[PDB]
């Protein structure tokens, strides 16, 4: 058993940048291979990034390719994906995904993984904070 804990998620401005993290349980150097998937009001779960057991095959989806960087500390059994140029279509809950098996090379399928996190929300929309 694998949990994980998604944070970074909120509110941000269309063209925009945030760093989600996703902790997973277990000692250091657990080495999962390891996924975001997103998904937004009214559309199917899809994949984002990913990276294998050992740290290779690095994969990102087409719709994110060039804007986001997925990395892994193997000290910390930590994700992040660093997600730039963000736009309304981005909005969604990410989700942490991490697989029971020594895979080397990412898999973008959802039913590829067996653990997943509660997710933590994406907001790319305009706004306005008033000031102090
Ligand atoms: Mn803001």
């Known amino acids: 058993e694998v949990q994980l804990v998604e944070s970074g998620g909120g509110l941000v401005q269309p063209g925009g940048s945030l760093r989600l993290s996703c902790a997973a349980s277990?000692?250091?150097?657990?080495?999962?291979?390891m996924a975001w998937f997103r998904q937004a009001p009214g559309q199917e779960r899809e994949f984002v990034a990913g990276?294998?057991?050992?740290?290779?095959?690095?994969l990102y989806a087409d719709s994110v390719r060039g804007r986001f960087t997925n990395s892994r500390d193997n000290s910390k059994n930590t994700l992040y994906l660093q997600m730039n140029s963000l736009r309304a279509e981005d909005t969604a809950v990410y989700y942490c995904?991490?697989?029971?098996?020594?895979?080397?090379?990412?898999?973008?399928?959802?039913?590829?993984?067996?653990?997943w996190g509660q997710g933590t929300l994406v907001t790319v929309s305009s706004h306005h904070h008033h000031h102090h």
């Open positions: 995904a991490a697989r029971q098996g020594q895979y080397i090379y990412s898999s973008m399928r959802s039913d590829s993984y067996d653990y």
């Open positions: 277990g000692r250091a150097h657990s080495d999962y291979a």
């Open positions: 990276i294998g057991w050992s740290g290779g095959d690095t």
